[PDB]
Amino acid sequence: EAIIRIPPYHYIHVLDQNSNVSRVEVGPKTYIRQDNERVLFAPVRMVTVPPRHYCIVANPVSRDTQSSVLFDITGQVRLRHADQEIRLAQDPFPLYPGEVLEKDITPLQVVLPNTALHLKALLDFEDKNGDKVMAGDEWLFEGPGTYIPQKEVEVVEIIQATVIKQNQALRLRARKECFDREGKGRVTGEEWLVRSVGA
Amino acid sequence: EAIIRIPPYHYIHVLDQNSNVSRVEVGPKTYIRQDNERVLFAPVRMVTVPPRHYCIVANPVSRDTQSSVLFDITGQVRLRHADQEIRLAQDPFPLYPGEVLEKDITPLQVVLPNTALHLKALLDFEDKNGDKVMAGDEWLFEGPGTYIPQKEVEVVEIIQATVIKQNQALRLRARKECFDREGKGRVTGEEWLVRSVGA
């Protein structure tokens, strides 16, 4: 049929045979497809992002400084393809053709006050405070709070802060040429203790 | 049929019977083949290179200093044939006829801080800092970071940095007329120790 029924908060993708490109048709419109227009799939609910959650969709539409969806000269949505987009929280928005949903309504991580996060970067990127982070740079994020899951930063594991009770010390061991809290040269294979009561 | 359907991000190869050569026809176009034109294969997704990955395709199109795809006088794409091309990360690009895909979306290697890479050159090439590398020259790349896989450089194995704890030393042995950290003449078959605590 040439008649389509789009509810107020649903979207579809139409591949125009003549216009030779695809585009998004956000509702609410019970739009009628032209003879050239062909609908791909049935109406699907908008990509909703409740608060206190997050999602990331690959191949984001590359928007300019005005955050407008730039359509290509041919007519297809201009995607970044390789890159990704960090979606924190907003109203239910339409997916554009060529966008692959990777994460969807996944809960925002919650770091406990007595734990941290182990982080891999994967290539170089500029940090929040203008810090150049290598592809193999190691970052630690202690809470409490809520870190934002980035496309340039990956979470490895959960660090459990070992508690040291009174008249105790913690045997450590360094896996690289690093510096501990006491600022002493910590070569690989060296061991040392902690001299402060507390987590 | 004379009608072809190319999605926005797919490509094919057409061998023109009269134009007597092949060329790439990048989309998005539901192009109609002429009577001389004959399509080889069905639409295939563009060669996509996500970030933090890499790929290398043999027989690259030899581009000039402007990085334009030079078409031959006959009309075929000018390939380097023997040579290769190092593709780091970019938008999904079309393969040209005569290009054989060797690597595709292979993850970029990640060197651990306490490991290195064993490298073979294979012929002579100019290094990053203008260093002439022989076909049999031996290079070591210690991390952490991300080395770029080159067409002129080959990775052999993974070196595990042996850790030397306190009051210990490492028994070494030289396989060539080389120089160790102490700058003493190290002939083949000679053995010596390491006199520094650390990895």
CSV table of C-alpha atoms in Angstrom, one decimal, chain B residues 1-2 6 24 28 38 42 51 59 66 86 89 92 106 110 118 123 128 138 153 156 165 179 183 187 193:
chain,number,residue,atom,x,y,z
B,1,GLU,CA,18.6,-6.8,-16.5
B,2,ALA,CA,20.0,-3.3,-17.2
B,6,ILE,CA,23.2,0.2,-5.2
B,24,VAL,CA,34.7,1.8,-9.7
B,28,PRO,CA,24.7,6.1,-3.8
B,38,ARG,CA,28.3,-5.6,-17.6
B,42,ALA,CA,26.3,-8.0,-6.4
B,51,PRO,CA,38.9,3.6,14.7
B,59,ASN,CA,47.6,-3.6,-5.4
B,66,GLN,CA,47.0,15.3,-4.5
B,86,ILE,CA,48.7,1.4,4.9
B,89,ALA,CA,41.3,4.8,9.8
B,92,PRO,CA,34.2,3.4,4.2
B,106,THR,CA,41.9,-6.3,12.1
B,110,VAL,CA,48.3,-3.1,21.8
B,118,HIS,CA,60.3,-8.2,17.6
B,123,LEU,CA,63.8,-4.9,2.1
B,128,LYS,CA,60.3,7.6,10.4
B,138,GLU,CA,66.5,-5.9,13.6
B,153,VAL,CA,58.0,-3.8,8.6
B,156,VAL,CA,57.9,-11.4,14.6
B,165,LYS,CA,64.2,-8.9,41.8
B,179,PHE,CA,76.7,-4.1,22.2
B,183,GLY,CA,79.0,-1.2,26.0
B,187,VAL,CA,80.8,-11.6,20.6
B,193,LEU,CA,74.8,-10.7,33.7
